[PDB]
C-alpha cells in the first residue's frame, strides 16, 4: 500500500498560529450579532416528563369531589 496520500492529515494543522501581532484579523462583520439557541435538539429531556405527565392533572381531579 501507500500511505503517502495521508499527508493531508498534517496539512489540516495549517500552522495553528492565529494571533494578532502586526494586524491580526479584525473585520466589520466580526463585531456583528449572532443569536442562537437550538433547544429542539435537546428534546430528549421530554422523556423525563413522561414520568409525570398527568401527575399534576391528578390534583385538579380532586376538585371533582
UniProtKB/Swiss-Prot annotation:
It comes from the Viruses. Changing residue 38 to S: In strain: Isolate GD01. This is Spike protein S2. The chain holds residues 758 to 821 of 1255 of the full protein. The record marks 41-42 as: Cleavage. It comes from Severe acute respiratory syndrome coronavirus (SARS-CoV). Glycans are attached at residue 27. Changing residue 22 to D: In strain: Isolate GD01, Isolate GZ50, Isolate GD03 and Isolate SZ3. Mediates fusion of the virion and cellular membranes by acting as a class I viral fusion protein. Under the current model, the protein has at least three conformational states: pre-fusion native state, pre-hairpin intermediate state, and post-fusion hairpin state. During viral and target cell membrane fusion, the coiled coil regions (heptad repeats) assume a trimer-of-hairpins structure, positioning the fusion peptide in close proximity to the C-terminal region of the ectodomain. Changing residue 41 to N: Complete loss of trypsin-induced membrane fusion. Changing residue 9 to V: In strain: Isolate GD03. Residues 42-63 are annotated as: Fusion peptide 1.
Amino acid at each position: 500500500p501507500r500511505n503517502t496520500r495521508e499527508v493531508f492529515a498534517q496539512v489540516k494543522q495549517m500552522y495553528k498560529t492565529p494571533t494578532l501581532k502586526y494586524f491580526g484579523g479584525f473585520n466589520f462583520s466580526q463585531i456583528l450579532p449572532s443569536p442562537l439557541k437550538p433547544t429542539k435538539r435537546s428534546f430528549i429531556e421530554d422523556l423525563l416528563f413522561n414520568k409525570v405527565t398527568l401527575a399534576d392533572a391528578g390534583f385538579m381531579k380532586q376538585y371533582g369531589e
